[model samples]
Structure formats: C-alpha cells, structure tokens
Target: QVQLQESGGGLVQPGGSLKLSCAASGFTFSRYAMSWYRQERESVARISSGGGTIYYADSVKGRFTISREDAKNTVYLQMNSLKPEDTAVYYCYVGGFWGQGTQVTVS
Candidate 1:
C-alpha cells in the first residue's frame, strides 16, 4: 500500500511564490512514478515523480513546477507569480493513491 501526505500550506500573496511538499511512504519511489495535480475551476497539469519528466497545461506550463527527491520519498510542487485565480486545492498521487489535498489561498 502507498500513502501520501502533503504539507506547506498557507496564504500566498498575489504575484508571490508558494511551495508545497508531498511526503510519500509505503511505496518504492523509484519503481513507481508519481504525479501532481491541481483542481480549481478546472483540472490542472501533472508532472512525473522524481522530476524526470513534466507535462503542464499550455497556460500553466511556465508557472507551475514539480520536483522530486527519490531518496527522501518526497515530491515538491511550486507555483510562482501566483494570482488570485491560482487559489485552489492541490494533490499528489503515488502508487495509485492520492493525498488528502491541500488548499492554497492567494490573498
């Protein structure tokens, strides 16, 4: 069984940057790939685990970034130059399991 938990949630001011961390357990980070997604008015993009590959929406490709540290079993999502519209719930999926979700608010 695989388990994922997210942290680093708080208010991010418009035009600022925010970083969220997803710590995973119970799975082999290298053997399986993970993904990160965001939900707001619509679904967002996804990036592969270990930062080996990335696929983001044309609109968000430049703003959203994902990185992973396989040794630590951790994946990171970063949103830069955020705007009010960017406020949404983010989630990470690993080994076919999803995290509880983290709400990010832009003030």
Candidate 2:
C-alpha cells in the first residue's frame, strides 16, 4: 500500500522554527518531483509552484529547504525562522500523490 509518515517535534512555541519530515514507501522518490503546500480557511489552496527542478517555492524565502535522503527513502521539509502565522498542516505532495500530512501547531 502507498503511505507516508511524518516525523517532527510534537510541539513548538511561538517564534520557533518548525522542522518536519515526510517518509514515503511503495513509490519511487526519484521518479517524481516533490511539492509542498498550505491552505487556509478563507484563502485558496496555494501550491509552491515549482515541482520539477526547483526544490523550494519561489514565494518562500530562503528559510525553506526540501531534500531527499536516499538511504532512508524519505523527503524532508525544513522551515527556519518560523513565525506563529507559519502554523499549518504542512504536506508533501508529488502531483498525483500526497503524504498523510503532519499538522504543526505553532503556539
């Protein structure tokens, strides 16, 4: 079965950085590009734009990085200088697929 696992610190205080990881199985990481997205109640779902050569979205400041660690077969999402407003259910997607997202609640 296709599945994804997310790992991160369970809690984060305001003005803290948020680091998250998405692990995938039953799929090929090299075959498809990785994507990250965020949705808010009153706003449309915003996709990070670049899914191919670009690893991180242009809209995102240099504070974000996405990478794959070949040894563990997992992709990672890291956000530095996180603000309270950065709290969201950070998800990892591969076009036609998605990881069971991990919710990061910032206090």
lDDT, candidate 1, 1-107, per-residue tens: 66788887668897898888889887577666666666734545565654667777655677887776778788877788877767878777765587887888998
Model 2: ten consecutive residues of lowest lDDT: 41-50
- Which 10-residue span in candidate 1 carries the lowest summed lDDT? 40-49
**Which residue pairs collide in model 2, if any?**
none
RMSD values for the candidates in order, in angstroms, are: 2.1, 4.2
User: Over the stretch 1-107, how does candidate 2's per-residue lDDT look in tens digits?
Assistant: 77667666345885567777777678666655556665342221222323345544553557767656656556667676665566776766665676667676777
Q: Using Cα atoms with residue i matched to residue i, what is each candidate's TM-score against the true structure?
A: 0.83, 0.73
Give lDDT for model 2.
0.60
